Amino acid sequence: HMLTNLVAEPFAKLEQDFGGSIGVYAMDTGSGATVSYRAEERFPLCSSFKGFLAAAVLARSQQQAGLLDTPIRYGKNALVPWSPISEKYLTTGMTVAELSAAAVQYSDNAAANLLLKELGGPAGLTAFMRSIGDTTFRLDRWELELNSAIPGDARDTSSPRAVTESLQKLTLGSALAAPQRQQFVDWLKGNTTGNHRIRAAVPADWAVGDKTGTCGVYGTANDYAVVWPTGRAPIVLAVYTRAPNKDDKHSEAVIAAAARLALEGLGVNG
């Protein structure tokens, strides 16, 4: 507690202007100081689960040395909306590693569903998260049904805090072996969908990896990231949003602004 919210930031005004709710957890891994706002509330994961999905695949690859190289062929019926990479390889197949990279870096939905099947579905991914000590995360459905973002529905949700804690374990801690940890970091660093979210609050000369989520309804969107400011320890953070009405729009700018406030609250000069 002593190191949580040492410096208050105007998150309430930000979410009121947005017309919804913002949840933020940010950790300075050097000192343990944190910024926390609605951090234990549940928010829909949307596509943000795909980062943890790739981490679960990497964990399995520690026991299955041929897994990442395995070629996966799929039919047209596997190509659900927003599959920008896997649609280009329908006639050839893709490797497990390629599917994982596409799920992380392009939010590819066909890739995500194929990898979910490899792990035993939503319960298999949930079990992986339990195995690293995350008791909050739950995945319940597949793409695209998991994006419904219904107010009060706990399916396919986590909390900003648990997201940040799990992200820390996987990217900086010991939940993955060192080679797989760096592969997970590298996939996050190569994400293409997050330039207007946490990255927009991070100076260009700092390293950063992230995974976004956008549900398309209920103003529900999010991003989580690991950030390496030069000269100090890395920061891990998560920013999640939702809003009360089905046709409320999400805002990338609100996510970037919340990330800026989190970094300011931690005293990280940007």
Ligand SMILES: *[B@@-]1(O)O[C@H](CN)c2ccccc21
């Ligand atoms: B997921 O939140 O990320 C992508 C991009 N906005 C996507 C598309 C369609 C459904 C879910 C998701």
